RNA sequence: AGCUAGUAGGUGGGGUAACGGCUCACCUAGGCGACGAUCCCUAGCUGGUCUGAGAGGAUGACCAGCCACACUGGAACUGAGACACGGUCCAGACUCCUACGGGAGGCAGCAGUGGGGAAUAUUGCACAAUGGGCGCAAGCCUGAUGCAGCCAUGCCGCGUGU
RNA sequence: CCGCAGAAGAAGCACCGGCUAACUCCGUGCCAGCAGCCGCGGUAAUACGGAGGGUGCAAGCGUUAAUCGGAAUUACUGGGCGUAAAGCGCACGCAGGCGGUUUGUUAAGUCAGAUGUGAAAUCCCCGGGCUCAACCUGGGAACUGCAUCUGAUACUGGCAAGCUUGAGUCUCGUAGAGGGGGGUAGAAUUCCAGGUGUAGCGGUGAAAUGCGUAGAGAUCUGGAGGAAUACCGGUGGCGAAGGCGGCCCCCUGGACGAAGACUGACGCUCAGGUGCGAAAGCGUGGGGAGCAAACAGGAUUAGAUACCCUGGUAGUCCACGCCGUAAACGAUGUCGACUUGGAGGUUGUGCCCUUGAGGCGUGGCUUCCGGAGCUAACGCGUUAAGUCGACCGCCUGGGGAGUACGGCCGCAAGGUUAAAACUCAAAUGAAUUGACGGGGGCCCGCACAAGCGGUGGAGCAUGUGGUUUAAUUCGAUGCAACGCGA
RNA sequence: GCUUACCACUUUGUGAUUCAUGACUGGGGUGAAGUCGUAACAAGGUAACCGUAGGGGAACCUGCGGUUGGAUCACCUCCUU
RNA sequence: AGGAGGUGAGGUUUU
């Protein structure tokens, strides 16, 4: 049933953007908060806050530069049905450097440019633009 | 469409039959016409058409259309078939190379001499 | 019976008689068997009492491997004097066009069963003519392209 | 959709230039198979070539590496190196010669002929150069090779004029 | 290479209506003929044959043969499954695929660095020589591959520990045509027996077959037998689907609601496999009131094998098995999360001044409209055809064809898997206009209905068709031709 | 020289697969609309379609289960909208 | 628009 938390998080984010919701809440995890941090580094969202101890709840606030949503496209890449791994320099660059292809590497979670600067690679979580 | 389904049974390509199976990947075939006659055409082009049934060297008998106005073709004729189908004749998918050991070019024809066998006249 | 299915489906035959025709040895000896091509014989006015036209000679293997026998050869209809001028007048101002229908035999003569058929009108091409006009207009209106 | 019992392994002998059921005697009754075993059809493989921006699809023209083959099949010997492409033995077909007592042959080498096909070459010259094998060596030969002939079969260039 | 006379010795093919670069004439007249398609050619062909003239390549031009591309038309990059081809009829489940949250540890998948190697040849880049080129050649890169040594621990995974947030059990109830068996009540129909009772009954748009003075039909009494349960009963409920409908009892499954306690990922989806599976049909033994395949008789029609009528067997009913096919449909596979809403039906529950049936709501099933969004549109729209993830199945132009053969199952009828040869260049789906409907609604008509008088019956004249001749010149053919041209 | 075992080829008997042929027979496609009826597209004049059984010279017809991928709505009377 | 009040199909299939 619940086969991928990351895909569910991306779907909830996209649905909140479509519905113009200000904040979206979900269960939290280390990978989820890492993805939230890597998104907030590039400022695709306002801020993420995780509350609670027995049931850790993460709530992310969506940015709105105008009526149009700040994030237009977001697509899961490394799905449980097919894992994706690229080389050191063969990571994809979405929209020729406009947007981030979130990648979890040996050191940790980072973006495509950070991975290229650090000279390593990993799995491509999702494209965001 | 599922990746697991594709892995368990790879997506295969559909075979496509050749429009001239009797040629067997050969540019031309030689045979002798078992019969030479005329066949009634389809609805719109009621113009009479000339055909011959010829049994090739491969043991298959095929019907081939005859081009030009006036044909130098008969039975017991060593002919040459090149391929090509006419949508106006039902069940006809072959063409005869007029000018191959038992046929002359179109009489009194001065155009498309290469395509109709005739050599270029001196004058 | 050589019913001439074209002249049967279109413009039913109305008048006919029995007469032979003149031919050489090349285009003969196969009409005795029956093979022929007499579908919609275009018999027109000839000074020699409307010489047989239209129908060709049978493609039977009687060829000298040069031609069948005669790609175009004279074929003569038979009438003493009854239908030269009358046939011209009928074709001119009646609409009846005489065509050959069948090849009956007295066991010796291949009889020209010519039938005087009515000239039937063409199908209404008033749609395809406009389609062709629109096609040529489309081909011509491609000027403003650079 | 089941196959296999010399088949899976072990214990010892023999055999191989060396490992090994390669083989023998005994014992254990396993081994392989849904990742396709067994069986049927097809197929020389690769570097590469064509078509494609790419992933892909087709194929193995020329050349190079490897494999297998030498009328079909079986077997062995010599030789370090073969079950031998112009060594040997034998079964079968075919062909040829014979004095009718009896013998020879295998162009998938160069050419060339008969047949097939839509369709494809001269029965040339030379060891002149390289290479090959033999030999003190000069030197022998090489249809490898190089050159020559025909074909517009494909690529390129020039000319029929200003 | 130098001299030798003279341009003197050397151009063809295809096409010319759009795709595609190119226009005129002559002749034939759906004929002859061109073609890859669209499509030409029915007296005026830039399309056919020829001629003239233009265009595209050129010692080479066209046809044909094979691969890919355009074909995103097998799509992994890069398709779809409600109506075009496509969700198995439904459920269980193995191998298999994937998998909630946290910690430690392994280095397996993954990432980084280094080594060897990826024969040469060939593609490519920088250069060079053949009059430049074709061709040859030097150097370099590449050949994305493979194995090895050491690190990285974010993710997937191996191992060891945990958690409830998923998944199940227990407590208490709620609703339910959920399933099976055994009894039981009434209405109605048929039949039998009894009484009264006469010329008709039955039936159709109309008639007749059919029954009937032997006493029918009709009306009161009693009895026999089979099927289904009028109302409640409802876009109501239950069940995985099919399906389930008087009442009672027995055995029993499933769903939801209330928190609480417990195990703690035990989970999701499945090829093969297993079970259920409307109706019809088949076998065995009963039963049969009505209904009625097939069949018989009477109607209709030009004929009726059928819709009209009277009979009428199998079956419809029960018990055990076989068959496993349906428009088995929500034409929409199962599971998990998110996304505006408006009105509803039914159930549980807290809750409020229960002031009353009402008020604030909340959970389980279901109906309609509808926003964003999606779709070719119709339309889906919190029960998505929307946003995504996990898995299985299915589709690749139509007919042939879910057909033959082969395999398996079944007593049989048959069911499952499942093609090719051949043929066509379309097949199809949504939607618009018109037309049509022995479709509906509305309004009109010497049109219908109501009256009055005419033709076809008789004589004569005018025109036409048929015949005839030397012509019976010729033109027109329902309304809209026929004392018409005239 | 004799002989034993291993084959290879040949022969016999019995099987399996494939091809061609085969008197005859069944179904399909194309062409003519030639013959016959009108089953479907409208309420196609008996609404069809799907499953299944039976019948007919055939399109089809009838018996039982299911769907709207069908039509008027209400030729009158009511009362709710 | 909640429930039941009824017509009118033997009278034409082809092109
Ligand atoms: Mg040993
Ligand atoms: Mg081979
Ligand atoms: Mg030799
Ligand atoms: Mg491509
Ligand atoms: Mg492709
Ligand atoms: Mg598609
Ligand atoms: Mg469909
Ligand atoms: Mg379903
Ligand atoms: Mg089915
Ligand atoms: Mg009855
Ligand atoms: Mg279905
Ligand atoms: Mg809606
Ligand atoms: Mg097909
Ligand atoms: Mg079948
Ligand atoms: Mg009808």
Swiss-Prot record, chain A:
Species for this entry: Escherichia coli (strain K12)
Its job: One of the primary rRNA binding proteins, it binds directly to 16S rRNA central domain where it helps coordinate assembly of the platform of the 30S subunit.
Pfam family, one: Ribosomal_S8
Gene: rpsH
Origin: domain of life: Bacteria
GO cellular component, one term: cytoplasm
Family under the similarity heading: Belongs to the universal ribosomal protein uS8 family.
Any one GO molecular function term: structural constituent of ribosome
InterPro entries from the UniProt entry: Ribosomal_uS8, Ribosomal_uS8_CS, Ribosomal_uS8_sf
Protein name: Small ribosomal subunit protein uS8
UniProtKB/Swiss-Prot annotation, chain B:
Sites bearing N6-acetyllysine, chain numbering: 107
Cellular component per GO, a single term: cytoplasm
Record-linked InterPro entries: NA-bd_OB-fold, Ribosomal_uS12, Ribosomal_uS12_bac
Gene3D superfamilies in the record: Nucleic acid-binding proteins (2.40.50.140)
Listed CDD domains: Ribosomal_S12
Modified residues (3-methylthioaspartic acid): 88
Classification via Pfam families: Ribosom_S12_S23
Swiss-Prot/TrEMBL GO biological process terms: cytoplasmic translation; Group I intron splicing; maintenance of translational fidelity; positive regulation of RNA splicing; response to antibiotic; RNA folding; translation
Function of the protein: With S4 and S5 plays an important role in translational accuracy. Interacts with and stabilizes bases of the 16S rRNA that are involved in tRNA selection in the A site and with the mRNA backbone. Located at the interface of the 30S and 50S subunits, it traverses the body of the 30S subunit contacting proteins on the other side and probably holding the rRNA structure together. The combined cluster of proteins S8, S12 and S17 appears to hold together the shoulder and platform of the 30S subunit.
Assigned protein family: Belongs to the universal ribosomal protein uS12 family.
Protein name: Small ribosomal subunit protein uS12
Gene name, Swiss-Prot/TrEMBL: rpsL
UniProtKB/Swiss-Prot annotation, chain C:
Keyword RNA-binding attached: yes
Assigned GO CC terms: cytosol
Coiled-coil residues: none
CDD domains documented for this protein: SmpB
Keywords (A to Z) from UniProt: Cytoplasm, RNA-binding
Entries under InterPro entries matching the protein: SmpB (IPR023620), SsrA-bd_prot (IPR000037), SsrA-bd_prot_CS (IPR020081)
PROSITE patterns in UniProt: SSRP
SUPFAM superfamilies for this protein: Small protein B (SmpB) (SSF74982)
Inactivation phenotype: No visible phenotype during growth on solid medium at 16-42 degrees Celsius on rich or minimal media, no peptide-tagging of proteins translated from mRNA lacking a stop codon by tmRNA, i.e. no trans-translation. 4-8 fold increased susceptibility to a number of antibiotics (norfloxacin, gentamicin, trimethoprim, tetracycline and streptomycin but not ampicillin), very significantly reduced production of persister cells. A number of bacteriophage development defects.
One annotated GO biological process: trans-translation
Effect of residue 126 to E: About half loss of protein tagging by trans-translation, binds tmRNA normally, binds ribosomes normally
Sample GO molecular function, one term: RNA binding
Annotated Pfam families: SmpB (PF01668)
Subcellular location: Cytoplasm
Its biological purpose: Required for rescue of stalled ribosomes mediated by trans-translation. Binds to tmRNA RNA (also known as SsrA or 10Sa RNA, 363 nucleotides in this organism), required for stable binding of tmRNA to ribosomes. tmRNA and SmpB together mimic tRNA shape, replacing the anticodon stem-loop with SmpB. tmRNA is encoded by the ssrA gene; the 2 termini fold to resemble tRNA(Ala) and it encodes a 'tag peptide', a short internal open reading frame. Able to recruit charged tmRNA to ribosomes. Does not play a role in transcription, processing or Ala-aminoacylation of tmRNA.
Family indicated by similarity: Belongs to the SmpB family.
Additional record remark: Although the Fu et al., electron microscopy paper indicates this protein came from E.coli its sequence maps to T.thermophilus. The same situation holds for Ramrath et al.,.
Subunit note: Binds tmRNA. The SmpB-tmRNA complex binds to stalled ribosomes.
Protein name listed in UniProt: SsrA-binding protein
Organism of origin: Escherichia coli (strain K12)
């Amino acid at each position: 049933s619940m086969q991928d938390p990351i895909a569910d998080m991306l779907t909830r984010i996209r649905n909140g953007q479509a519905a113009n919701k200000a904040a979206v809440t979900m269960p939290s995890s280390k990978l989820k908060v890492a993805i939230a941090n890597v998104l907030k580094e590039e400022g695709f969202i306002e801020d993420f806050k995780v509350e609670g101890d027995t049931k850790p709840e993460l709530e992310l606030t969506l940015k709105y530069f105008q009526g149009k949503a700040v994030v237009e496209s977001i697509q899961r890449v490394s799905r449980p049905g097919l894992r994706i791994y690229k080389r050191k320099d063969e990571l994809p660059k979405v929209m020729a450097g406009l947007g981030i292809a979130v990648v979890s590497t040996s050191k940790g979670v980072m973006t495509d440019r950070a991975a290229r600067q650090a000279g390593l690679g990993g799995e491509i979580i999702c494209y965001v633009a | 469409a599922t990746v697991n389904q594709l892995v368990r049974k790879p997506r295969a390509r559909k075979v496509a039959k050749s429009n001239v199976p009797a040629l067997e990947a050969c540019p031309q075939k030689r045979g002798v016409c078992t019969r030479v006659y005329t066949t009634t055409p389809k609805k719109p082009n009621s113009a009479l058409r000339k055909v011959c049934r010829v049994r090739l060297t491969n043991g298959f008998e095929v019907t081939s259309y005859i081009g030009g106005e006036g044909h130098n073709l008969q039975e017991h004729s060593v002919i040459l078939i090149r391929g090509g189908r006419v949508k106006d004749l039902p069940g006809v998918r072959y063409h005869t190379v007029r000018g191959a050991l038992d046929c002359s070019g179109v009489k009194d024809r001065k155009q498309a001499r290469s395509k109709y066998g005739v050599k270029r006249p001196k004058a | 019976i050589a019913l001439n299915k074209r002249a049967r489906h279109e413009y039913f035959i109305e008048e006919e008689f029995e007469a032979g025709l003149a031919l050489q040895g090349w285009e003969v000896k196969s009409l005795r068997a029956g093979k022929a091509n007499i579908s919609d014989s275009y018999v027109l006015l000839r000074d020699g009492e409307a010489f047989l036209f239209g129908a060709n000679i049978t493609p039977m293997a009687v060829a000298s491997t040069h031609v069948v026998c005669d790609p175009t050869r004279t074929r003569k209809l038979l009438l003493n004097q009854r239908e030269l001028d009358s046939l011209y007048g009928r074709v001119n101002r009646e609409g009846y066009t005489v065509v050959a229908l069948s090849l009956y035999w007295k066991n010796a003569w291949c009889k020209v069963k010519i039938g005087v058929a009515k000239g039937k009108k063409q199908h209404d091409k008033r749609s395809d003519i406009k389609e062709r006009e629109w096609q040529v207009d489309k081909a011509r209106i491609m000027k403003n392209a650079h």
